[PDB]
Amino acid sequence: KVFGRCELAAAMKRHGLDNYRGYSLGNWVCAAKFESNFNTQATNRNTDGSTDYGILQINSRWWCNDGRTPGSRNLCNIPCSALLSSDITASVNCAKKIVSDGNGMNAWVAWRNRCKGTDVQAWIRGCRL
């Protein structure tokens, strides 16, 4: 499903992402905007043969198993297809493991190049208090 901006902001807040590891909710909505355009079904294959899955484009080389990435580590212990669900719970629980791994949100190349250091507050403007 393609979330709307305020709609995604509210679901992420319910899942405890606002200020998870000190990253405010605007950061997570901006990451999802530029990673998938708010679309839970987005997939993209990488140069090395791994694929990125879902709203936060989580990669099969380390985080989920998709049956076709040699050396996939599957650290969130999920099939990658679970990350394409209209329910974002598995994507959020895996993203909390990724962001806690020491490199923060720099793990999402679109967050580093398009969101980091911008006014990310503009992304949750209008979301219900």
Side-chain angles (χ1 to χ4, degrees):
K1 85 176 244 63
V2 183
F3 284 79
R5 186 177 59 75
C6 294
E7 185 193 8
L8 183 61
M12 289 184 144
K13 179 184 176 189
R14 281 184 61 214
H15 287 80
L17 280 178
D18 185 19
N19 236 72
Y20 186 76
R21 260 44 175 164
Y23 289 95
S24 57
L25 191 62
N27 282 286
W28 300 102
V29 173
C30 187
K33 173 59 184 187
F34 296 125
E35 288 291 351
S36 61
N37 224 324
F38 297 149
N39 179 13
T40 69
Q41 296 192 74
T43 55
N44 285 284
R45 201 159 174 51
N46 298 135
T47 45
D48 58 1
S50 59
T51 302
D52 297 340
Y53 296 89
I55 206 162
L56 280 163
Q57 291 290 278
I58 290 168
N59 176 269
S60 63
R61 185 178 180 159
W62 318 86
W63 302 109
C64 60
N65 189 0
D66 63 358
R68 65 163 192 205
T69 310
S72 173
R73 274 308 302 149
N74 197 12
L75 299 166
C76 293
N77 284 157
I78 33 171
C80 294
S81 56
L83 300 167
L84 301 188
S85 177
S86 52
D87 167 31
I88 67 167
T89 305
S91 274
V92 171
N93 294 159
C94 191
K96 286 177 182 163
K97 302 189 179 183
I98 301 174
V99 80
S100 303
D101 124 305
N103 190 218
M105 279 195 82
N106 297 300
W108 286 283
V109 70
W111 172 84
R112 183 172 63 74
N113 291 332
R114 312 183 69 171
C115 305
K116 181 177 184 168
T118 66
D119 180 41
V120 303
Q121 289 200 168
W123 286 108
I124 50 111
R125 278 204 193 126
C127 65
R128 264 175 167 124
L129 273 14

